[PDB]
Each structure stands twice: as C-alpha cells, then as structure tokens.
C-alpha cells in the first residue's frame, strides 16, 4: 500500500489514496461487486434452506424469495409454491459468479498495474478528462438499458410475471400489450406525491410497468449511444465540477433519492410488491379488518361500518377512514362507480376474498426489534415483523445516510476545486479584504 | 449593465448585514410566510377538529389558552395525507376547521430550513473556509423532518405530527411512548447518550479552557490526564474539537433514524413475560411496570 | 505600527478593534488599486487606438502585475474581472507584433482565467498571425472541444 | 439548558474544525468565524474567554434549576394544574 507521508491521508482515509490509481480503483470496485453478489447468493441459499412452502412467504422472514417469486418462478395461481428449485439455482449461480468476480477483484487490486493509462489506452482515464468519462457513462448506460430490455423480454416472451390483479387471485400471466403511450407513462412522473396521487408509487397494472420499462430501456440505450459519441456542452462544462469526488457526490445524491423512493414504494405499493409474498400493507391490513368485521356481522344501510368520504364516496368507517385511498385485488370487484357498491357488499362475496381478508387482518405491519409481533402493549405471544417494515426502515436509513454523503463529498469537491481543502491562507485571507461589518 | 446584473450583484453581495445567497432567495419568503401564519394562527384561530369526529380542539390564545397550553393544532384526520391548500377548501371557515394552517406552516418551514442548510454552505464557500458546518446542521433538520414529515407518512395521516406548541409537544411525546416503546429503543438510548455527552463535554471544555487562562493547552492536557487517567488522548486541539462536533451530531442522527423507523411500526424492545418460573408462572420485572404505564396511556389516549 | 497589535490579538483570537482598522485599510487600499488599474487600462486603450502598441502592451502588462492575491469574487470568480480582458489584450497586442508562441501562451492563460467567448477568438483578425501556428488550434480545442465527434459517427455509419 | 449545551458543543466543534489555518499562534481564524456567524445567524462571539465561559455556564445553570424543581417536587409542591382551565 502506501503511508501517510507519501499520500497525506491517514489510515482511516486510506481508500482516498486510490483516486489517481486507475487499476487499483478498478480492482476495488470489482471486489466490491463480488461482495454484493456473494451476499445475494448466500442470502438466497440461506432463505431457501429455511423455507416451508406450506406457509405464506411473509409469515417467515424472507426477503429475496418474494423477489424471485414476483419474477414468476415456481408460483401457481394464488401464490402457491409449485416448486422451490429455481430459487436454489439462482442462489448457486450468484455464488459462483461471486467467486469469479472476487478473483478478478483481488487480481486487479494487488497484481495488475497501478495505472492503466500507459499500457492500455482504452481503459485509461483521468478525472479531469471530459470525453473518456462520457464514454464510460455511455457504456454503462447501454448496460442498464440492456438489463431493462432483458426484464421486458422475460415478461413478454417467457413464463411471464406474477400479475396480482388477475381474476380470482393473482396468477403468472404473460403480458401481451404493454402500454407504450407516452402520456400515461409520463403522467406518473408529473403526478402529485400527496393523497390519492402517489407519484410513481401509484402504479397499479403490470402493463404500465412493462411499457415504462420499455420506454426507459430504449431511452437509456439512446442516451448511452449519444454520450459515447459526444462531449459535454459549454454550459455543462461551466456548471459542473470535473473531478472524481464530484462524480461521487452526484452519484451519492442520486442514489440517496432512489433509496427514499424505494422505501416509499415498498411501504405503499402492492403490485410490484404483491401482498401474497411481502404481506399486506398497513392500509391493506386496516381495510381488510374493517371488511372482515363487516362481513362477519352481516352473516350474523351502512351497517355500522360504512361512511361518507370527505369528497362523498362510500368508505369503511372507524379510524380506517384515513386509509380510504387503498385499492386491492380482493376489494376492487366489490367497488362501484361511487365508492363501495352496497348491493355488491351484500352479495357476490366469494369465499376466497373473505379468506384473504381474514389472513391479512392478523398480519398487520406491526412489530418490534425484539421480534414480537403486535402492539407495544401486547405480551410475548407471536414473533412476526412484516418484510415491508424491514425493507422500508433499512432503505430509508440508507437513503438518509447517502444523502449526508452527497452533502459531505459535494462540499469537499467544491472546496478542493477552489483550493480551500487545506485551510485559510494565513497571509491573504478573504475576510481581511472586506469592509468591517456594521 | 442590465437590471439582472445589478440584481445578481446585490443578491450575492457579501456586504449586507445578513447574507442572502441564492439559497436565501427561497429561504426568506418561505420562512417569512411560515412565521407570519404561525403567529396569526397562534394568536387567533378557531378550534380544529383534530380527530375528524366533530369534536374540535381549541389551541388559540383568544380561545382560552395561555402561552403554555396554546398551540397550532395539526390538521384533521379526514384529510389524511391529502394536499390541502387554501384554494381547495370549500370555504375559509372550512379550511380553518380542518387545520390547514398546520400543513402550510410545516411545508414552508421545512423548505426554509433546507434552504438555510444550503445557505450555510454558500456563505462558507464565499468566505474561503471548509464547508462542513452544513453537515453538522443536518442533524437538527433531519430530526425536525422526521418529527413533522416522515412520521405522518408512516402513520398515514398528518394528524399524527407534532403540534406546534408546548403542551402539544408533551401530548405528542406521551402518546408516542404509549403506542411505541420509545424509551426501550437503542436509537433513543443513543440520542439520550448524545445529548448528555454533549452537555458533559461542553461543560468540561469550557471549564478547562477558561481555567487554563494566562495573565496553555499543555497545562490543561496535563490536568485532564492526571484527573481521569487519560494520558494518551486529546493531545491535539483539532482532534478534540472534531470529537466535540462529532458526538452530539451522531447521537441526533441516530435518534432521528429511530423516529423514522418507528414511523413504519418497528418499535423498541418488548421484554414482557420474559422471566418465568417452574410451572410457567410469570415473575414481574421493571419492564412489566413500564408496560402497565404504557397500557394506561394507550387506554386513556383513545376516544372511541 | 498597528500591524504589530493586530498580530498580537490574532495570536490570541479575540478579534476586537485591532483588526478593524487593518481591515478597513486593506479594503480602501484594494478599492483605490482597482480604480488605478481601471484608469491605466483606459489610458492603455486610448494610446493603443493610435499606434503606440509597445506602450499599450507595457501598460497592460503592468496592469496584470498589479493583481490581487487569492482573490474571491462575489460570484466565486477567483480572478479580477479586468484580469481576463487584460490578458486577452496582451495576447492581441503580442500577436500583432509576431512572437506567436508567447502570444498564444498568453491567450491560453486568458482562457484559463475565464473568457468563454471563444467565437471572438476565432473571428478576431488581430490574432491572424496566431492562426498561422497550429498550436493556436491545439490550445483552442483543449479549451473548446466540439461536442459531436463527427468523424467517428461517419465512420460507424459507413460500415 | 441541556439542549442548548448540546447545540453549543456541536457549533463550537464544527466552527473550529472549519476555520483552521493551513500548515503560540492560534490554530484557527476567529475573524472568519465571527464574520460567518454574524452574517448567518445575526449574532456571533468575539471573545474566546466569553465563548468558553458560556459553554461552561449553560449546562450548570440548567441542571441547578432542574435540581431546585426536584426539591420542590420532594414536598409534593407541583406545578400540576391551571385552575382557570380546569
């Protein structure tokens, strides 16, 4: 490695010594990617081993299995596990790829050349350069677009994806007409984030998701092609800072925002995160409890469970009035043009809807760090914390910390570009050249 | 020159009594609107139906409250998470009855504090100094955002936010302890530790520096080393001041994160019925008395 | 003089009225220096308008020499606003007097210190001698790289 | 008092660490910090003695007032209710 005297960075800033070493940085990045896929494979195998297919996927603390299920592997209608082999093959494949990536990372980190500028001009960059960076960005944008189009291809020309809005419960459907209309796709972006409008978290049908992925894949491929053959415009040069720490700052800010968005989507959305796998959302649990009480007392005109909305729709009464924007596959059939349909609430309630509502009622998203499901005043009876709560909390924390990272690194990047990272000049400081404050 | 030129020179001018950067352009009107509406509502505002059951709660000064009990009631429960501007209410009276001022004040105040955090960096860059005071300020603003914004999002209603008052703050804290075991949570423990350590280190640093006065950092370091057996730490003043900055900031970050996690119903430790006996007879512990207090608070908190 | 007591209070870090007079003196001194630089620039331009190119060049060079150190502009300039235009005038005046290498070096310094108006450089006639040296175009493309790589895209479209 | 003490600790640490000189004489510029806090907040410290004595003074006063309050509670002398509100 290197010491403090020859670099100026202490041990607790050791990685900062790799800014000007291309090969070392590449090796470190590859090793970290190997770590990521190692965790993916190991966790997949661990969750596969500790899996009881008879019970729902959310009663036991599974996180990656819901993902592989909603991709549509080994899932029958209603969420039953047909088989558990694809999960195993995914885990082992990720583990082997991790071994490969780790070997590459260690090799590039401590065998290969420190700087790739001389021997290999193609894989040679200087942060100050403004064209090679765009080339790299274009290559990686092409990779991301290829990944998105791979998802679309899987959902359109393979076994398909688990559509949870299929009649009679969710089922593995093959999308045959994704919505490519630009208006409906970008309406999600231009949508409000308050109340009934949930921004991109409000997406419901799988057709819109697939169409949006088509749009994003083609846009990313075109953007990569553009960036490979282009140099930033003069205003872009004047507005940004061109150094490694600045690029890291931009990435940190973007990834923190994405972490917040993922937290919100995991907590609220229930289509890309089907309730059969991740469990019911909080609003879903409350609405299901209200519906279950209503039907139980009906089989025993509002029926002491209905109420008028602030805008004038039939909604479930009680405190559940706050969760009156919820839409679910087991509740939409009973919905009418103006709120709930009284005639449909009185008849045509299939047993599967009642069973699903009862199941969701007892598994509301409540829990504790001690892993004791229920309210904070309840005794130790059952251990259950919903995967939705874990995902939301973890990714909110990560998003906040990465936003703090953007703040720190952007400040340091601007200071270093201006030449303030060391300190005050001690001979000609700006304050001594200023009129005294009145 | 163009009028835009003179306007830009005045805005970015560093000769003003209070610096108003490009961030300040948004900070000033937002904070001014927030404080104006807060003052007007606190002095005089009709009772707010905080629960949406036609049982209004009064918090204004002209409706009976003194300074301690006065507050700006958070918006109604019928609104939920809906955006409630002054121009979507049926009437101004209806807007007042549903607690719109709370939403207006909280939105403008959050925008103002974010722009203030930006302005700190802007003036730090202008003067030629290292820009990390904004990072230190990021802890109270994060705590305020978690109190006012993230918790309503997790709970699904703005009516769960902190009331803009004193007795409202106490009620929010008691109800929160009832619903979530705030005290028996590691992140609140680190928050308390951070606050107590901040006070302790502030007192210690102040005393040492004001006692080492000449008519001597070495003398203070020697005294401290002879006192608490710490002979190999805090020899460098820069490291000492960095530790002073780091401790409370990290504590507040962690307590804000704990608040945000509880917003998604992830409470603290629940050591109820943990200690048992042969033949399965429960033996009580202190956590059981804490549970009894929480049960009383939760039972009395509800209204129907 | 008062610098001694300003240093004395600085060694303790108590601010006070000792720093205030030094601060005011520095502020007024820099203001009058900037005014003197502006009037020297005007005089140099006036003398350049009727030949006398060497005198104008000397005056502009003296203007460059009297540059504040560690300048921080209100808009984060890090350089005096007159500095870039005086550097460009150095480049122009030298270019009209042959010695193309140092002229393009001064132009490079001017573009480093700002002066984003690259079009003026291309359309300028006084820099015609600089057009002879390809190093002018080299420095220009180092400081103005055309956005579209036309040759690569044409080659790819060909195959 | 306790919250103000925590605030003072954070402000002092961040301000000293962000006004250092590049490397008897002080290790940071008091003038720059004073200018920054005068143009940001409105008021700023100008004397090191006063700043560090304030840091000392705040928490001690807060804790002493808390102790007086607890002494009052020891005799059930409480600030419990407002008779007009009741």
């Amino acid at each position: 490695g290197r010491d403090q005297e020859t670099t100026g960075f202490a041990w607790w800033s050791g990685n900062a010594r790799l800014i000007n070493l291309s090969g070392k940085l590449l090796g470190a990045h590859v090793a970290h990617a190997g770590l990521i896929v190692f965790w993916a494979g190991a966790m997949n195998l661990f969750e596969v081993s500790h899996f009881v297919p008879e019970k729902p996927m959310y009663e036991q603390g599974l996180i990656l299995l819901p993902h592989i299920a909603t991709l549509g592997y080994g899932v029958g209608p209603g969420g039953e596990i047909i088989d558990t082999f694809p999960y195993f093959v995914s885990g082992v494949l990720h583990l082997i790829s991790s071994a490969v990536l780790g070997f590459g990372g260690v090799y590039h980190s401590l065998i290969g050349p420190e700087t790739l500028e001389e021997s290999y001009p193609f894989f040679g960059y200087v942060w100050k350069d403004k064209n090679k960076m765009t080339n790299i960005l274009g290559y990686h944008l092409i990779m991301l677009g290829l990944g998105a189009w791979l998802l679309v291809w899987k959902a359109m020309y393979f076994g398909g994806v688990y559509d949870t809005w299929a009649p009679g419960g969710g089922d593995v459907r093959v999308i045959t007409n994704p919505t490519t209309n630009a208006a409906v796709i970008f309406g999600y972006l231009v949508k409000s984030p308050f109340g009934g409008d949930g921004w991109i978290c409000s997406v419901d049908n799988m057709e819109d998701i697939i169409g949006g992925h088509i749009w994003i894949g083609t846009l990313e491929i075109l953007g990569g092609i553009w960036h490979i053959y282009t140099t930033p415009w003069p205003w872009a040069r004047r507005a940004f800072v061109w150094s490694g720490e600045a690029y890291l700052s931009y990435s940190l800010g973007a990834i923190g925002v994405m972490g917040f968005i993922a937290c919100c989507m995991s907590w609220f959305n229930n289509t890309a995160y089907p309730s059969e796998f991740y469990g019911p959302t909080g609003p879903e649990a409350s609405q299901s409890q209200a519906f279950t009480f209503l039907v139980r007392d009906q089989r025993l005109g509002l029926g002491k469970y209905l109420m008028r909305s602030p805008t004038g729709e039939i909604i479930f009464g009680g405190e559940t009035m706050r969760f009156w924007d919820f839409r679910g596959p087991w509740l939409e059939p009973l919905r009418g043009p103006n709120g709930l349909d009284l005639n449909k609430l009185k008849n045509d309630i299939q047993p599967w809807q009642e069973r699903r509502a009862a199941e969701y009622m007892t598994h509301a998203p409540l829990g504790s760090l001690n892993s004791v499901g229920g309210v904070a005043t309840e005794i130790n009876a059952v251990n259950f914390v919903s995967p939705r709560s874990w995902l939301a909390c973890s990714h909110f924390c990560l998003g906040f910390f990465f936003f703090i990272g953007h703040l720190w690194h952007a400040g340091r990047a601007r200071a270093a570009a201006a030449g303030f990272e060391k300190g005050i000049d001690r001979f000609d400081e700006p304050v001594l050249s200023m009129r005294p404050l009145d | 020159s163009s009028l835009w030129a003179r306007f830009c020179e005045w805005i970015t001018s560093t000769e003003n009594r209070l610096y108003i950067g490009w961030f300040g352009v948004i900070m000033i009107p937002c904070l001014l609107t927030a404080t104006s509406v807060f003052i007007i509502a606190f002095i005089a505002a009709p009772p707010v139906d905080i629960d949406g059951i036609r049982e209004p709660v009064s918090g204004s000064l002209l409706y009976g409250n003194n300074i301690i009990t006065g507050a700006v009631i958070p918006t109604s429960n019928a609104i939920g998470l809906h955006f409630y501007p002054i121009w979507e209410a049926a009437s101004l009276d209806e807007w007042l009855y549903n607690g719109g001022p709370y939403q207006l004040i909280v939105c403008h105040f959050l925008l103002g504090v974010y722009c203030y955090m930006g302005r700190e960096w802007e003036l730090s860059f202008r003067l030629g100094m290292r820009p990390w005071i904004a990072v230190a300020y990021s802890a109270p603003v994060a705590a305020a955002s978690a109190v006012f914004l993230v918790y309503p999002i997790g709970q699904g209603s703005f009516s769960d936010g902190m009331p803009l008052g004193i007795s409202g703050t106490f009620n929010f804290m008691i109800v929160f302890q009832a619903e979530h075991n705030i005290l028996m949570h590691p992140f609140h423990m680190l928050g308390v530790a951070g606050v107590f350590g901040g006070s302790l280190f502030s007192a210690m640093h102040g005393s040492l520096v004001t006692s080492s006065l000449i008519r001597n950092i070495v003398a203070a370091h020697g005294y401290f080393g002879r006192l608490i057996f710490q002979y190999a730490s805090f020899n460098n003043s820069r490291s000492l001041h960095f530790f002073l900055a780091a401790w409370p900031v990290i504590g507040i970050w962690f307590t804000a994160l704990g608040l945000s996690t509880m917003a998604f119903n992830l409470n603290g430790f629940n050591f109820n019925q943990s200690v048992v006996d042969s033949q399965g007879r429960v033996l009580n512990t202190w956590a059981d008395i804490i549970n009894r207090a929480n049960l009383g608070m939760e039972v009395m908190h509800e209204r129907n | 003089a008062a610098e001694k007591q300003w240093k004395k209070e600085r060694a303790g870090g108590n601010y006070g009225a000792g720093t205030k007079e030094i601060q005011a003196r520095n502020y007024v001194q820099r203001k009058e220096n900037e005014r003197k630089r502006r009037e020297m620039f005007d005089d140099a331009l006036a003398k350049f308008k009727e030949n006398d190119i060497q005198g104008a060049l000397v005056e502009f060079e003296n203007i460059i020499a009297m540059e504040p150190r560690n300048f921080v502009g209100d808009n984060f300039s890090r350089n005096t606003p007159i500095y870039k235009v005086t550097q460009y005038n150095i480049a122009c005046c030298y270019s009209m007097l042959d010695q193309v290498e140092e002229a393009i070096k001064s132009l490079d310094a001017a573009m480093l210190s700002g002066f984003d108006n690259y079009d003026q450089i291309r359309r300028d006639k006084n820099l015609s001698k600089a057009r002879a040296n390809p190093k002018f175009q080299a420095v220009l493309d180092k400081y103005d790289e055309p956005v579209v790589n036309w040759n690569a895209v044409k080659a790819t479209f060909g195959a | 008092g306790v919250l103000g003490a925590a605030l003072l600790c954070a402000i002092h640490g961040a301000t000293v660490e962000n006004t250092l000189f590049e490397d008897a004489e002080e290790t940071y510029s008091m003038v720059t910090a004073n200018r920054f806090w005068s143009q940001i907040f409105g008021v700023a410290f100008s004397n090191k003695r006063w700043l560090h004595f304030f840091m000392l003074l705040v928490p001690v006063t807060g804790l002493w007032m808390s102790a007086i309050g607890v002494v009052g509670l020891a005799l059930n002398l409480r600030a419990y209710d407002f008779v007009s509100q009741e």
Binding site: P436, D438 | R17, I43, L61, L62, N66, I67 | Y15, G16, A17, T19, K20 | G42, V43, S46
Partner: peptide, 27 residues
C-alpha cells in the same frame, strides 16, 4: 386581558431580539 399581556411580552421579546441583531455595538 391575559391574551393582551401575553402578546405584549412576546412582542417585547421579539423587539429585543431585533435590536440585538441590528443595533449591536461595533468591535
């Protein structure tokens, strides 16, 4: 008139803050 005296005290505090900000003595 309790609200009146409360408001007067608060406005007095705000005025003291404003005067301290804008009418501070020079160093």
């Amino acid at each position: 008139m309790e609200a009146l005296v409360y408001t007067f005290l608060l406005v007095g505090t705000l005025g003291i803050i404003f005067f301290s900000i804008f009418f501070r003595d020079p160093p």
